[PDB]
Amino acid sequence: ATVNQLVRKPRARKVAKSNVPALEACPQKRGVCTRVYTTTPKKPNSALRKVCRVRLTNGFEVTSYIGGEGHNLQEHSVILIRGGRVKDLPGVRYHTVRGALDCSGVKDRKQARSKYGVKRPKA
Amino acid sequence: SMQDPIADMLTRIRNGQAANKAAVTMPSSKLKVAIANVLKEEGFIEDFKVEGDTKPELELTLKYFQGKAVVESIQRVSRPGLRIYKRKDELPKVMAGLGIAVVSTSKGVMTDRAARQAGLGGEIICYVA
Amino acid sequence: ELQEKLIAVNRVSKTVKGGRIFSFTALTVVGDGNGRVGFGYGKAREVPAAIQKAMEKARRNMINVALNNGTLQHPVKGVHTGSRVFMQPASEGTGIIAGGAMRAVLEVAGVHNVLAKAYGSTNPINVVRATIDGLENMNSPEMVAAKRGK
Amino acid sequence: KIRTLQGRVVSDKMEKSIVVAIERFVKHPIYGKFIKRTTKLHVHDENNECGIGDVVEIRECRPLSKTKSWTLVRVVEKAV
Amino acid sequence: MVTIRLARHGAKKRPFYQVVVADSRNARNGRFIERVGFFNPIASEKEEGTRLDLDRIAHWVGQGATISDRVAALIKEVNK
Amino acid sequence: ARYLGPKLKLSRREGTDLFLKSGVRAIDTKCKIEQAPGQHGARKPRLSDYGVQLREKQKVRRIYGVLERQFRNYYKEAARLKGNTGENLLALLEGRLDNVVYRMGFGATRAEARQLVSHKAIMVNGRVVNIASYQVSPNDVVSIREKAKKQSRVKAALELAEQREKPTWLEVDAGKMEGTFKRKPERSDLSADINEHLIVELYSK
RNA sequence: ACCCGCAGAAGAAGCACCGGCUAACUCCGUGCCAGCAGCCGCGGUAAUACGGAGGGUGCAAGCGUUAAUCGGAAUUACUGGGCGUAAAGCGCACGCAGGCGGUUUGUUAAGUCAGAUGUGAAAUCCCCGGGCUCAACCUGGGAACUGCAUCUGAUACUGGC
RNA sequence: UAGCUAGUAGGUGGGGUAACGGCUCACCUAGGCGACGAUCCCUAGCUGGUCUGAGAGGAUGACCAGCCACACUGGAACUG
């Protein structure tokens, strides 16, 4: 550029990939879950993947991702929703937390028990 | 036009070396001559002459040792908008000491070696190797 | 007297049918650990041939490094396309300083008291051409009857 | 030493005081070069020797009036 | 106006106290212009007990600084 | 906890006894000595070659009884006060109180020498020391506390002092259970199985 | 505090990871399905990648996960970027305010630099040392805040005249 | 979002404050301000400082020191 430029203005910079406005700047929110659907994934693989429609207890409505040895969800029973990157399906931003509210853990685990939910003690 | 003395003097010399010229000519001034008066002291030139009275021209003869080249870098680095000003220790050690810096001081145009010996600082005009 | 080293190996990309080609590329270096270096690139079928074409190129060239106080005689620029390399001297009793891939070339030249910046492509087969453009741009005077230094 | 400035008269439409414009240098926000900046202020005068285009010398005093702290010292150069 | 007083020399629950010269107004944190020894209220049979600095006090003896109740026995705990 | 499980595994990974569980003649003990672990072998990939320095760091960590977080701090101290970092670090871990109690023959192994420090049996310059990280310097005097000098595991460690290389930089006498650290180790005067030209090339992460 | 007893090894070890980068791996179940990952990718009967299982790798009283903000991005180029084409030169010319302008001798000392005074606390990163078992906390001076004001100077260069 | 404007702009009296000044009650004239973004609208505690780094800045405002306002709210006054 020419040596007199960049007067009375700073440089513009880029935003750090913020994408989850229904969370109100919080790490998580509650949602009731209303419908479940199936979506065709990208790149050639013998696979199909699932999504759920979620109304949030803060007046929003979005589509969220589901997995962890399949799904356990049911209408209006209440679950948690947070940000999670995919990749796994196109056009999606949100993820479902396991071992919390109506959402189950993973049945019978011997390692990695601090991830994706594990059964409660007794007996 | 003669709008800038340094964007003339250094450019004529740097391009004159790419032409393998023994000597190069320019419109003369007491600033261009004060720089030649340092280049001769540090051994870069073997001669310079000023001729023309009321339209004076400066012609300086580069001191070659064997075949080609006499300057391994000849840059201004400073700008007319904001010039490079340095305090009495802040004088640059050009090409890690294989070159020199030329300084404008209240005691005239001199080397960073001579400015440091005089306890002076000022404005940098040339960075030379 | 003599130091030898392997820097890089890569298979040729080409899908040729059907399958891929069996050609490989290699990059090796030779030096003395005292002030000299040479380099070689080679292309042939499978690594045990490609590495030998690279060694036989590296064993056919040798350039001197200009040294003073055990470090570079001056800071120097050397360029090949996207590899815009600048090499500069370091402090007394030093070696890290050098790391990454530049360590592999300075290890056969013998001088880890040298700092580098690539200002673009660090691609090993191309940056090695820019460093030796810098070694051809090293000054050895041949000027001490008029100019200061040494 | 006294606290003084010089500047040009730019409006003489008031009952006693005058309006004067002074110039100063300020640094470019990244390239550090000095560039020129105007300051336009009211100046205290009770003698009425000058009008627009004239250049005057001014001194900084005690506060003289609401937002006025500078007084006219002398005329330095007349327009034409 | 300065008085000879104490200042806290860190160490949790373990009082060593630095002896300092300061004006006896406003907050007691800092405000001291010179250090003149250590009160050392926790030393017992050690060759490094209660200490003075006979040069740093030399402007402040006699009338030079005020003496406070806190240090009125310092001259008999030091050697001497 | 302090290592846990069998220590002799480290001596099988070399094919040479690594001075582990040593007693009396330190030979045989029907422990599978000089035999390789496992059965698949054999026939193994020949490193990255970057892994060669990570394995060389492993040897020094297992021998001198230190973890990565502390090894990085010893490298930072060794990269100072002249000489190369590889030689300086290999002499800096030699200056540990737990290693000096082992070189003075009061422990047959570094695990039982480190036990004397962890159980506060060790004295340095008339002060009792409970830290194994304690730095031993030129002319420092190290001894066993007077009512612990007669404990028999220290007397059983003297059986190795007549078999090992006498450390040229320190001097000791079991008739008083007292020794002195004379000088800082030099690589011309102490030879090791550690590759000193590899442990300099670290970090690199 | 600091030291000394009674009880009996008495109450005290996990967390992530095991296809590749990435050290650790093999044996069954499934058979392009179902499940898995940071990215590349895995899966049709020999799956080290899914479930199951023994051991192993790395960290350890912690180990993994994550949110925001920086950083690699010399991928907003002050340090340190471009505009024939891949992304950018106004349709074009004129011009008020701004930016920029030959040369020498006087003169001024604003800008620049020099000799000093005053200050930038506690700290920063760093060099050397101290009060307490180490350390915090507290230090006690260096290195330093390269600016801002005043005093006393220099006049080449830039600007004023 | 490009215009804003009768303490707005200069002047004359007498008050007020510890003190300069419209701070204040009353006159006499028609000026003054805006691209360094005035006006209009939204939103808000913050500097020395921190993390990263050759250096600098977007964001942040703990420490260790400073610093604007509030005590339901909208506001006022005395004592000092």
Amino acid in the structure at residue E27:
A
Task: Give chain D as a 3 state SS string.
Answer: CCCEEEEEEEECCCCCCEEEEEEEEEECCCCCCEEEEEEEEEEECCCCCCCCCCEEEEEEEEEEECCEEEEEEEEEECCC
Q: Is the CB of A111 under 7 A from strand G?
A: yes
Among B65, B95, B100, beta carbon nearest to C143: B65
CB spacing of B66 vs C142 below 8 angstroms:
yes
* Helix residue ranges, H only, B5-125: 6-18, 30-39, 112-117
**Residue C99, φ and ψ in degrees, nearest 5:** -155, -165
Note whether B96 and B62 are within 8 A (CB).
no
Measured CA to CA in angstroms, residue F201 lies from C28, C135, F87, F204 at distances of 20, 25, 12, 7
Locate the chain C residue with the closest alpha carbon to B46: C146
Distance, CA of C146 to CA of B64 (rounded, Å): 9
Task: Give chain F as a 3 state SS string.
Answer: CCCCCCCCHHHHCCCCCCCCCCCCCCCCCCCCCCCCCCCCCCCCCCCCCCHHHHHHHHHHHHHHCCCHHHHHHHHHHHCCCCCCHHHHHHHHCCCEHHHHHHHCCCCCCHHHHHHHHHCCCEEECCEEECCCCCECCCCEEEEECCCCCCCHHHHHHHHHHCCCCCCCCEEEECCCCEEEECCCCCCCCCCCCCCCCCCCCCCCC
- Residue closest to C51 by CA, chosen among C32, C25, C72: C25
Q: Is the CB of E8 under 7 A from strand H?
A: no
Note whether A98 and A104 are within 8 A (CB).
yes
**Residue F195 C-alpha from the chain's centroid:** 16
Note whether B119 and B3 are within 8 A (CB).
no
For strands F140-144 and F122-124, give the pairing.
Answer: antiparallel
Distance, CA of E9 to CA of E15 (rounded, Å): 8
A17: which 2 tokens? 């990939």
Q: Looking at the C1' of nucleotide H33, which residue has the nearest alpha carbon?
A: D40
Taking the CA of residue D75 and the C1' sugar atom of nucleotide G161, their distance in angstroms comes to 17
Q: Which residues of A touch D32 (CB under 8 A)?
A: none
C57: which 2 tokens? 């190129």
State the CB neighbour count (10 A cutoff) for residue F159.
15
Note whether C28 and C4 are within 8 A (CB).
yes
> Is residue B24 helix, strand or coil?
strand
CB spacing of D29 vs A4 below 8 angstroms:
no
Which nucleotide does the CA of D44 lie closest to, via C1'?
H10
Distance, CA of A113 to CA of A119 (rounded, Å): 9
Q: Which residues of B touch C76 (CB under 8 A)?
A: none
For E19, half-sphere exposure in the C-beta direction (CA atoms, 13 angstrom radius) is 25
Measured CA to CA in angstroms, residue B16 lies from B99, C139, D10, F12 at distances of 20, 20, 54, 74
- List CB contacts of D27: < 8 A, sequence separation 6 or more: D33, D34, D35
> Is residue A21 helix, strand or coil?
helix
| Chain B 39-98, CB < 7 Å to strand G | 80-81, 85-88, 90
Q: Which residues of B touch A7 (CB under 8 A)?
A: none
Taking the CA of residue F82 and the C1' sugar atom of nucleotide H74, their distance in angstroms comes to 74
- Residue closest to D48 by CA, chosen among D22, D1, D9: D9
3-state helix, strand, coil in chain A (%, to 5): 0, 25, 75
Q: Which residues of B touch A3 (CB under 8 A)?
A: 79, 81
Query: Distance, in angstroms, between D29 CA and closest chain A CA?
Result: 6
Sketch the domain layout of chain F as residue ranges. 7-93+190-204, 94-180
State the CB neighbour count (10 A cutoff) for residue C117.
11
CB spacing of C99 vs F204 below 8 angstroms:
yes
Touching E: which chains, 3+ CB pairs < 8 A?
none
Distance, CA of F195 to CA of F60 (rounded, Å): 10
The three-point CA angle A6-A8-A10 to 5° equals 60
- List CB contacts of E43: < 8 A, sequence separation 6 or more: E49, E50
Distance, CA of E7 to CA of F180 (rounded, Å): 43
A14: which 2 tokens? 């880029």
Per CATH, the number for A1-123 is 2.40.50.140
Distance, CA of E75 to CA of E79 (rounded, Å): 8
Query: Distance, in angstroms, between D28 CA and closest chain B CA?
Result: 9
β-bridge partners, C3: C31
- Residue closest to F204 by CA, chosen among C102, C124, C108: C102
CB spacing of B63 vs C146 below 8 angstroms:
yes
User: How deeply is E78 buried, as exposed, middle or buried, from its count of CB atoms within 10 A (0-12, 13-18, 19+)?
Assistant: middle
B58: which 2 tokens? 């400066």
Q: What is the largest CA-CA distance in chain F?
A: 55
A115: which 2 tokens? 């991830």
- List CB contacts of C105: < 8 A, sequence separation 6 or more: C7, C29, C37, C39, C128, C131
Q: Which residues of D touch A6 (CB under 8 A)?
A: 29-31
Note whether F162 and F69 are within 8 A (CB).
no
> Is residue B56 helix, strand or coil?
coil
Span between the terminal Cα atoms of chain B, in Å: 29
Q: Which residues of F touch C96 (CB under 8 A)?
A: 79, 85, 200
Which nucleotide does the CA of D36 lie closest to, via C1'?
G98
Residues of B with CB under 8 A from a CB of A: 79, 81
- Residues present in chain C in total: 150
D63: which 2 tokens? 């506060």
Instruction: Return the residue in D26, D30, D33, D34 with the most chain A beta carbons within 10 A, the one to mutate for interface testing.
Output: D30
Query: Distance, in angstroms, between A24 CA and closest chain B CA?
Result: 48
- List CB contacts of C122: < 8 A, sequence separation 6 or more: C83, C101
Q: What is the DSSP letter of C42?
A: E
> Is residue C118 helix, strand or coil?
coil
Per CATH, the number for B5-69 is 3.30.1370.30
Sketch the domain layout of chain B as residue ranges. 5-69, 74-128
Q: Which residues of F touch C103 (CB under 8 A)?
A: 201
Which method was used? Answer: cryo-EM
What count of CB pairs under 8 Å joins A to D? 9
Taking the CA of residue E26 and the C1' sugar atom of nucleotide H75, their distance in angstroms comes to 34
- List CB contacts of C80: < 8 A, sequence separation 6 or more: C126, C127, C129, C130, C133
Note whether F89 and F70 are within 8 A (CB).
no
Amino acid in the structure at residue C59:
R
Distance, CA of C2 to CA of C108 (rounded, Å): 8
D8: which 2 tokens? 């040009």
Sign of CA pseudo-dihedral F39, F40, F46, F52: negative
Architecture per CATH, domain B74-128, reads as: 2-Layer Sandwich (3.30)
C146: which 2 tokens? 């008029």
Q: Is the CB of E28 under 7 A from strand H?
A: no
E55: which 2 tokens? 């040069």
C87: which 2 tokens? 């090499």
What count of CB pairs under 8 Å joins A to B? 3
3-state helix, strand, coil in chain E (%, to 5): 10, 25, 65
Taking the CA of residue D34 and the C1' sugar atom of nucleotide H1, their distance in angstroms comes to 32
CATH superfamily of F94-180: RNA-binding S4 domain (3.10.290.10)
Distance, CA of A104 to CA of A119 (rounded, Å): 9
F124: which 2 tokens? 């340095």
**Residue B103 C-alpha from the chain's centroid:** 9
* Helix residue ranges, H only, B1-129: 6-18, 30-39, 112-117
Q: What is the DSSP letter of B16?
A: H
Asked if D touches C (at least 3 Cβ pairs < 8 angstroms), the answer reads no
CB spacing of A4 vs B81 below 8 angstroms:
yes
β-bridge partners, D21: D8, D40
E37: which 2 tokens? 């020894």
Taking the CA of residue A110 and the C1' sugar atom of nucleotide G16, their distance in angstroms comes to 13
Q: Please, which residues 1-60 of chain D have a Cβ atom closer than 8 Å to chain B?
A: 28, 31-34
Q: Is the CB of D14 under 7 A from strand H?
A: yes
- Residue closest to B49 by CA, chosen among B58, B40, B41, B36: B58
> Is residue C58 helix, strand or coil?
helix
**Residue C67 C-alpha from the chain's centroid:** 16
DSSP string, A75-93: TTS-EEEEE---SSSTT--
Taking the CA of residue A16 and the C1' sugar atom of nucleotide G69, their distance in angstroms comes to 10
Note whether C76 and C85 are within 8 A (CB).
no
**Residue B118, φ and ψ in degrees, nearest 5:** -85, 0
For A56, half-sphere exposure in the C-beta direction (CA atoms, 13 angstrom radius) is 20
Which nucleotide does the CA of D66 lie closest to, via C1'?
H21
Measured CA to CA in angstroms, residue C128 lies from C41, C80, C83, F201 at distances of 10, 9, 9, 22
Distance, CA of E26 to CA of E7 (rounded, Å): 14
Note whether F136 and F97 are within 8 A (CB).
yes
Report chain G positions within 7 A of protein CB atoms.
13, 15-18, 22-26, 32-43, 51-54, 58-61, 63-71, 74-79, 81-83, 89, 98-105, 110-115, 121-122, 131-132, 135-140, 146, 150-151, 153-158
Helix (H) or strand (E) holding C126: helix C124-136
Locate the chain B residue with the closest alpha carbon to D33: B82
State the CB neighbour count (10 A cutoff) for residue C52.
15
Q: Which residues of A35-54 are buried (b: 16+ CB within 10 A; e: fewer)?
A: eeeebeeeeeeeeebebbeb
Note whether F179 and F104 are within 8 A (CB).
yes
Locate the chain B residue with the closest alpha carbon to C145: B65
For D79, half-sphere exposure in the C-beta direction (CA atoms, 13 angstrom radius) is 11
**Residue F148, φ and ψ in degrees, nearest 5:** -110, -15
Distance, CA of B48 to CA of B103 (rounded, Å): 20
Q: What is the DSSP letter of B71?
A: -
- Residue closest to A55 by CA, chosen among A94, A27, A91, A84: A94
Distance, CA of C5 to CA of C79 (rounded, Å): 23
Peptide linkage before C54 cis (omega within 30 of 0): no
Backbone region of residue F184 per phi and psi (left: phi > 0; alpha: psi in -120 to 50; beta: other values): beta
Topology agreement, domain F7-93+190-204 and domain F94-180: no
Measured CA to CA in angstroms, residue B126 lies from B45, B98, F7 at distances of 15, 15, 69
Distance, CA of F58 to CA of F56 (rounded, Å): 5
Where do the DSSP E strands lie in A1-123?
Answer: 29-31, 35-39, 49-55, 61-65, 79-83, 94-96
> To the nearest 10°, the Cα dihedral for F2, F7, F12, F14?
50
Where do the DSSP E strands lie in chain E?
Answer: 3-7, 18-22, 32-38, 51-52, 66-67
Resolution (A): 17.0
Query: Distance, in angstroms, between B65 CA and closest chain C CA?
Result: 6
Please name the residue that has the structure tokens 């460690």: F157
β-bridge partners, D77: D55
> Is residue C10 helix, strand or coil?
strand
Per CATH, the number for F7-93+190-204 is 1.10.1050.10
Q: Which residues of D15-45 are buried (b: 16+ CB within 10 A; e: fewer)?
A: eebbebebeeeeebeeeebeeeeeeebbbbb
Helix orientation angle between F68-78 and F51-64, rounded to the nearest 10 degrees = 100
Query: Distance, in angstroms, between B95 CA and closest chain C CA?
Result: 6
| CA-derived radius of gyration, chain A | 20
Helix (H) or strand (E) holding C50: helix C47-58
Distance, CA of F94 to CA of F141 (rounded, Å): 16
Q: Which residues of B touch D31 (CB under 8 A)?
A: 79, 81-82
